[PDB]
C-alpha cells in the first residue's frame, strides 16, 4: 500500500529534485495570480502656470 | 542642372510671400487689417522674417537629444521641397516612370518631421504633441491612396503627364463629384494651417514641432509646413482641374494653371479661420467610422465603370 508520504515525492516540483536551481514554484492550478502590481503609468503635466493658450 | 535651383529659391519666396496671405486674407476674413506698416502694403515684412529668425535667433534645446532634433528640420525641408520635382506642370523635372507613387511616398515620409520632433526633447511634454500628430495623420493615409485609385482608374495610369491630357473638354470634378469633396478634407492629413489639421497649432495644447524647436529650426519648420499647403493645392489642380493643354504655347497654360491653384490656395486659409478643431478622438471618427465605408463604396463603383463602358489607357 502507498500512503501520503510517498505521494509527496510525486508532487508538483521537479520530479527528481535537487539540482543547482530550485527557485521554481509549483504552477498555480488555474493560471497565475494577477501581476496587478508594479507600474502606475501615471503621466504628470504642468499644463497651466503661464500661456497655455487655454 | 539649373532647373532644380530655379525651383527652390523662387519657391522658398512663395512660402515667404505666403505669410502675407496668411494674415491678409485671414485678416479680412476676421475684419482686421494685416500687413500695412513695413512696406507699401507690408510687402517688405515677409523677407524681413528671414533676417529676423535666422541671423539673430540662437536657441538649442536644454536636455535635448544627440544628433536627432537638428536632423528634423533637414528632414522637414529636404523631403517636402523634393515634392516639387515629380510635379507635371507644363513640363516636369525628370518625368517619373510612375508619377503619383513618388508623390504619395514622399508625403508620408514628410510626416517624420513632426515624428522626430517628439524625441527632440527627452521630456514628456513635447511627445504628447507628437503622439497626437500620429493618429491625426495615420488614419487619413488610408483614404488618400484609395480616393487616388478611383481617379487613376478613371483616367490614365500613375504617370502625372497623362493626367493633363485626359482633361480636354471637361474637368474631373463633375464625374468624381463626392470624391472631389473628399480632397478638401484628405489633403489636410499633413500638419497644415486648417480647421481639421493636426497637432501643430496652439489653441488647446502646446505647439507640436515648435515647443521643442528654437527659432532657427522652428523657422525652418514653417518653410516646410506651409510649403505642403501649396503642394496639395497644385496636386488638386492636376487631378481635378485641367481646362486646356496646348503644347505649342506654354504661356497660355502657365497663366491658366496658376489662377486655378490660387483659388484653392485661398480656400485652405478660408477653412482655417472659419471652423474650430475637430478633437483628437472625433477626427478618428469622421474618417474610418463614417468616411471610409463611403470612399470604398465609390472605389467599388469606379472599378465597374471602365468595364461597363470602355475606359482603358
Curated annotation (Swiss-Prot), chain A:
The modification N6-acetyllysine is found at residue 25. It is found in: Mitochondrion inner membrane. It comes from the Eukaryota. Core subunit of respiratory chain NADH dehydrogenase (Complex I) which is composed of 45 different subunits. Component of the iron-sulfur (IP) fragment of the enzyme. Interacts with NDUFAF3. Interacts with NDUFAF7. Interacts with CERS2. Core subunit of the mitochondrial membrane respiratory chain NADH dehydrogenase (Complex I) which catalyzes electron transfer from NADH through the respiratory chain, using ubiquinone as an electron acceptor. Essential for the catalytic activity and assembly of complex I. Redox-sensitive, critical component of the oxygen-sensing pathway in the pulmonary vasculature which plays a key role in acute pulmonary oxygen-sensing and hypoxic pulmonary vasoconstriction. Plays an important role in carotid body sensing of hypoxia. Belongs to the complex I 49 kDa subunit family. This is NADH dehydrogenase [ubiquinone] iron-sulfur protein 2, mitochondrial. It comes from Bos taurus.
UniProtKB/Swiss-Prot annotation, chain B:
Keywords: Electron transport, Formylation, Membrane, Mitochondrion, Mitochondrion inner membrane, NAD, Respiratory chain, Translocase, Transmembrane, Transmembrane helix, Transport, Ubiquinone. It catalyses: a ubiquinone + NADH + 5 H(+)(in) = a ubiquinol + NAD(+) + 4 H(+)(out). Disulfide bonds: none annotated. GO terms for molecular function: NADH dehydrogenase (ubiquinone) activity. It is a multi-pass membrane protein. The keyword Membrane applies. GO terms for cellular component: mitochondrial inner membrane; respiratory chain complex I. The keyword Electron transport applies. Its EC number is 7.1.1.2. It is found in: Mitochondrion inner membrane. The chain crosses the membrane at residues 1-20, 68-88, 98-118, 144-164, 170-190, 220-240, 251-271, 292-312. GO terms for biological process: aerobic respiration; mitochondrial respiratory chain complex I assembly. InterPro entries: NADH_UbQ_OxRdtase_su1/FPO, NADH_UbQ_OxRdtase_su1_CS. Pfam families: NADHdh (PF00146). Core subunit of respiratory chain NADH dehydrogenase (Complex I) which is composed of 45 different subunits. Core subunit of the mitochondrial membrane respiratory chain NADH dehydrogenase (Complex I) which catalyzes electron transfer from NADH through the respiratory chain, using ubiquinone as an electron acceptor. Essential for the catalytic activity of complex I. Essential for the assembly of complex I. PANTHER family: NADH DEHYDROGENASE SUBUNIT 1 (PTHR11432), NADH-UBIQUINONE OXIDOREDUCTASE CHAIN 1 (PTHR11432:SF3). Belongs to the complex I subunit 1 family. This is NADH-ubiquinone oxidoreductase chain 1. It comes from Bos taurus. The gene is MT-ND1.
Amino acid at each position: 500500500q502507498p500512503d501520503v508520504e510517498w505521494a509527496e515525492q510525486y508532487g508538483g516540483a521537479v520530479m527528481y529534485p535537487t539540482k543547482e536551481t530550485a527557485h521554481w514554484k509549483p504552477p498555480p492550478w488555474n493560471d497565475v495570480d494577477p501581476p496587478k502590481d508594479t507600474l502606475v503609468s501615471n503621466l504628470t503635466l504642468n499644463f497651466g502656470p503661464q500661456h497655455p493658450a487655454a | 542642372m539649373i532647373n532644380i535651383l530655379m525651383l527652390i529659391i523662387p519657391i522658398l519666396l512663395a512660402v515667404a510671400f505666403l505669410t502675407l496671405v496668411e494674415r491678409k486674407v485671414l485678416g479680412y476674413m476676421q475684419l482686421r487689417k494685416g500687413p500695412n506698416v513695413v512696406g507699401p502694403y507690408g510687402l517688405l515684412q515677409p523677407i524681413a522674417d528671414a533676417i529676423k529668425l535666422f541671423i539673430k535667433e540662437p536657441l538649442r534645446p536644454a536636455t535635448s537629444s544627440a544628433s536627432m532634433f537638428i536632423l528634423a528640420p533637414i528632414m522637414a525641408l529636404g523631403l517636402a521641397l523634393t515634392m516639387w520635382i515629380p510635379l507635371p506642370m507644363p513640363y516636369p523635372l525628370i518625368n517619373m516612370n510612375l508619377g503619383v507613387l513618388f508623390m504619395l511616398a514622399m508625403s508620408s515620409l514628410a510626416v517624420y518631421s513632426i515624428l522626430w520632433s517628439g524625441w527632440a526633447s527627452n521630456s514628456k511634454y513635447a511627445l504628447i504633441g507628437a503622439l497626437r500628430a500620429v493618429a491625426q495623420t495615420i488614419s487619413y493615409e488610408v483614404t488618400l491612396a484609395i480616393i487616388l485609385l478611383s481617379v487613376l482608374l478613371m483616367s490614365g495610369s500613375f504617370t502625372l503627364s497623362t493626367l493633363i491630357t485626359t482633361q480636354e473638354q471637361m474637368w474631373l470634378i463633375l464625374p468624381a463629384w463626392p470624391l472631389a469633396m473628399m480632397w478638401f478634407i484628405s489633403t489636410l492629413a499633413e500638419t497644415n494651417r486648417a480647421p481639421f489639421d493636426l497637432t501643430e497649432g496652439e489653441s488647446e495644447l502646446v505647439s507640436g514641432f515648435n515647443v521643442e524647436y528654437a527659432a532657427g529650426p522652428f523657422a525652418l519648420f514653417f518653410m516646410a509646413e506651409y510649403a505642403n499647403i501649396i503642394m496639395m493645392n497644385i496636386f488638386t489642380a492636376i487631378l481635378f482641374l485641367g481646362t486646356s493643354h496646348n503644347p505649342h504655347m506654354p504661356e497660355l497654360y502657365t497663366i491658366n494653371f496658376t489662377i486655378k491653384s490660387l483659388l484653392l490656395t485661398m480656400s485652405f486659409l478660408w477653412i482655417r479661420a472659419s471652423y474650430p478643431r475637430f478633437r483628437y478622438d472625433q477626427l478618428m471618427h469622421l474618417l474610418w467610422k463614417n468616411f471610409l465605408p463611403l470612399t470604398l463604396a465609390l472605389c467599388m463603383w469606379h472599378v465597374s465603370l471602365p468595364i461597363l463602358t470602355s475606359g482603358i489607357p
